[PDB]
């Protein structure tokens, strides 16, 4: 409701139909182990922001017991509950598109057979700042083509949710495990990518700071790992 | 009422995925058996055809049995005195099997590579099941394959559909005969998951979402203002 | 002349009454709809013949308010050229202050001038909150109603 406690973590939130369960499939086994809220560093949505992109499970790779079990076990299988909250007054306008893209293969900014380096396809808690400059070996950051050559308007076929600061300030997207294999290596392959894209730009009133924090809180749910490293050899 | 919009029917139609050209001539003093076009192998790549690539990449995953129709037609643009009656071996190399390097290799008589022997002018037809390693093919792969090192980000061997190799079983005549082979793939028992955005920009690579630089805007401009109908 | 996020944003302006906000025809194979998910899959086939689901979304501040009047001109007719002709036809007077998202079902067409028009006019001027001046934006959405058919599949080239 407003004191959702998951593990030793607790967040305060608002919902009436806020959870977007992706493709109407709740995450389920093929909690109570690594299921807690991991609250990423708040991004600053300024007036000239282009967007942010976090890879999952790569955004949670240093996050405590989850990131420990991610590198301890080879194979894993996790769903997610992603809360994106952009707290504001009733004077801010603007609109975020919080979208979850399964298998978001990125495009390099050099074209041809040039591929994106592991430094940039796995950026961690920092994510990809889409308003920054293209670095050598990084992805293309042109937000109109969704970093993959497909237009930004057609990004609503993926499980998405708007944060219209006029209407709400939170977006919850309940991600299941989406892959073509039943279990996979969590360290070399990103299942989904969370993107938070300002479509309508942030307008502040005169007398307000032209910036606004965005908090992403990812709770991994129904997280499984491989039976090896605890399976007996007898 | 909407049976044309099924993915069994939208993705399931015979497109031209490969057109190769092999020749019937002697290998006497022939070094390279590909520059001579004595044979041609082709890694089965449905994303080589950008009309079928743009339809397959409307989905994240796709699982289909395959269906290959092979049309071989001859041609003799030299002095010939007769049109020869030729037989083509259309050999399906499965995923993980070795490809031919010569037209008289051991691979052509390998029993585990299924091969079709058919006449030129006639047509071949066979079906290959789902030979992927995942439970579906990956139109898009956000990550690396099999390795912790650099593995090209989306280039994965899970999407290996096999290989088709083509030679003429016949020996040479005194004239050169040019057989052009057209492979027609039809995805059957198609099922697809996670619909994606349609691709607006053209392609630069296979297996990569890279679009060309300084390309043209896909959203086309009005002839007036936003109020102009 | 380039593709950008600003092309999805329908600009609204203060101190404009009885002007037009936007206006488009409803050929969903050309124009604004050619690159949408509807119009990329419509242009794989030849004949569509269904109802459309047209939405708008007001993204300006919670204190701003305006009345926009959302005219549907059916096919065969002329699109309106003042706010009053829009009101005398099929419309919604949509109060931006109250309803932040409007959903309008375009009637069954078989549209393949023609296909219909769709315009938006300022009923009232845009009232902005104090010392918050400039432009606010609309986001427009298109989809298909579940009676939408699609037949005689064809091939786009490049």
């Amino acid at each position, epitope marked *: 409701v407003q004191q959702i406690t998951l593990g030793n973590s607790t967040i305060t939130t608002q919902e009436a139909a806020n959870a977007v369960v992706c493709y109407a499939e709740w995450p389920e086994y093929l909690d109570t182990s690594v299921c807690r809220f991991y609250t990423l560093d708040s991004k600053t949505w300024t*007036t*000239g922001s282009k967007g942010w992109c976090w890879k999952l499970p790569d955004a949670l790779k240093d996050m405590g017991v989850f990131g420990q079990n991610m590198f301890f076990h080879s194979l894993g299988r996790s769903g997610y509950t992603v809360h994106v909250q952009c707290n504001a007054t009733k004077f801010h306008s603007g609109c975020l598109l919080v979208v979850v893209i399964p298998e978001h293969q990125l495009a390099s900014h050099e074209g041809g057979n040039v591929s994106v380096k592991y430094t940039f396809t796995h950026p961690g808690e920092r994510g990809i700042d889409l308003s920054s400059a293209n670095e050598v070996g990084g992805p293309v950051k042109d937000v109109i083509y969704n970093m993959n050559g497909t237009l930004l308007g057609n990004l609503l076929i993926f499980p998405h949710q708007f944060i219209n600061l006029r209407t709400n300030n939170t977006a919850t997207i309940v991600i299941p495990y989406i892959n073509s294999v039943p279990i996979d290596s969590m360290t070399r392959h990103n299942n989904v990518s969370l993107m938070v894209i300002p479509i309508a*730009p942030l*307008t502040v009133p*005169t007398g307000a700071t*032209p910036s606004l924090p965005i908090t992403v809180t990812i709770a991994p749910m129904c997280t499984e790992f491989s039976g090896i490293r605890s399976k007996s050899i007898v | 009422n909407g049976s044309e919009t099924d993915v069994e029917c939208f993705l399931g139609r015979a497109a031209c995925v490969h057109v190769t050209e092999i020749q019937n001539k002697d290998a006497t003093g022939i070094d390279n058996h590909r520059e001579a076009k004595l044979f041609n192998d082709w890694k089965i790549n449905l994303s080589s055809l950008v009309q079928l690539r743009k339809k397959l990449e409307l989905f994240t995953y796709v699982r289909f049995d395959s269906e290959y129709t092979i049309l071989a037609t001859a041609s003799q643009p030299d002095s010939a005195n007769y049109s020869s009656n030729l037989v083509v071996q259309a050999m399906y190399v499965p995923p993980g099997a070795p490809n031919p390097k010569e037209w008289d290799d051991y691979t052509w008589q390998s029993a585990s590579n299924p091969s079709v022997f058919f006449k030129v002018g006639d047509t071949s037809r066979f079906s290959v099941p789902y030979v992927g390693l995942a439970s579906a093919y990956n139109c898009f792969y956000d990550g690396y394959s099999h390795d912790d090192a650099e593995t090209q980000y989306g280039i994965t061997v899970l999407n290996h559909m096999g290989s088709m190799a083509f030679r003429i079983v016949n020996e040479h005549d005194e004239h050169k005969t040019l057989v052009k082979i057209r492979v027609y793939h039809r995805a059957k028992h198609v099922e697809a998951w996670i619909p994606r955005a349609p691709r607006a920009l053209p392609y630069t690579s296979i297996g990569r979402t890279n679009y060309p630089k300084n390309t043209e805007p896909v959203i086309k401009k009005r002839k007036g*203002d*936003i*109020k102009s109908y | *002349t*380039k593709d*950008e996020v*600003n092309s999805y944003l329908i*600009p609204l*302006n*203060a*101190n*404009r*009454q*009885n*002007e*037009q906000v936007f206006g488009t025809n409803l050929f969903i194979g050309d124009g604004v709809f050619k690159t949408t998910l509807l119009g990329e899959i419509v242009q794989y086939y030849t004949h569509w013949s269904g109802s459309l689901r047209f939405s708008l979304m007001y993204t300006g501040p919670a204190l701003s308010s305006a009345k926009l009047i959302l005219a549907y001109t059916p096919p065969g007719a002329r699109g309106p*050229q*003042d*706010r009053r002709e829009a009101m005398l036809g099929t419309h919604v007077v949509w109060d931006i202050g109250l309803q932040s998202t409007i959903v309008m079902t375009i009637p069954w067409t078989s549209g393949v001038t023609s296909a219909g028009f769709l315009s938006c006019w*300022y009923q009232t*001027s845009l009232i902005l909150p104090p010392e918050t*001046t*400039g*432009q606010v934006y609309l986001l427009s959405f298109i989809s298909a109603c579940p009676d939408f058919k699609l037949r005689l599949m064809k091939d786009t080239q490049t």
Partner: antibody
Amino acid sequence: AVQLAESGPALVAPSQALSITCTVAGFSLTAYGVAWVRQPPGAGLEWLGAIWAAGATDYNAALKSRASIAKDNSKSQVFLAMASLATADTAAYYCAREWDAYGDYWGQGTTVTVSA
Amino acid sequence: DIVLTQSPAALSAAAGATVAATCRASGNIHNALAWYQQKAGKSPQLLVYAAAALAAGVPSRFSGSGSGTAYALAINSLAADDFGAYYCQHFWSTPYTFGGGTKLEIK
């Protein structure tokens, strides 16, 4: 063709009014608005105001009191009037069409000098 | 009000040099800027609208850039026709104020 022919008396004593008009040939004032921009010689361009495509007008912050803009929709004429004229009003006055709410199709402009 | 400060005031360059006029606003224009070109005794003509989009009848030598408050007008490989006074105008919040102006002269 979209053309906006400026027309003014151009010889006006100060502390008087202005009847400097723009006949609109090519488009309609009900579907587009007209922006007014003056430029004194030596100094740069200065916005005066814009009557919108249906009635509404905007002005300079310093010239809300002096300037006033109306239009005739049938005769396609746009009217600019100013009160309490000074020597700083010696300027070529221009009309425009509002293209994407910007300003273009500027006429050649009538140089209107306020003199004794 | 949004006040445009167009720096510099005048530039001396040859036909082929790169000219980068600059406008910086007090408020945030949100890329709703228009650049103008004017000759001696001629009407101003529109070069760049929306701070990046070249207008109709504008060559590809002109290139609008910049976002937010600061906006550059980079002109590459000048010709003989491209000498004159250049004025910004923002079209965001009514009033639509101009900038100061950059004139081009030959070295």
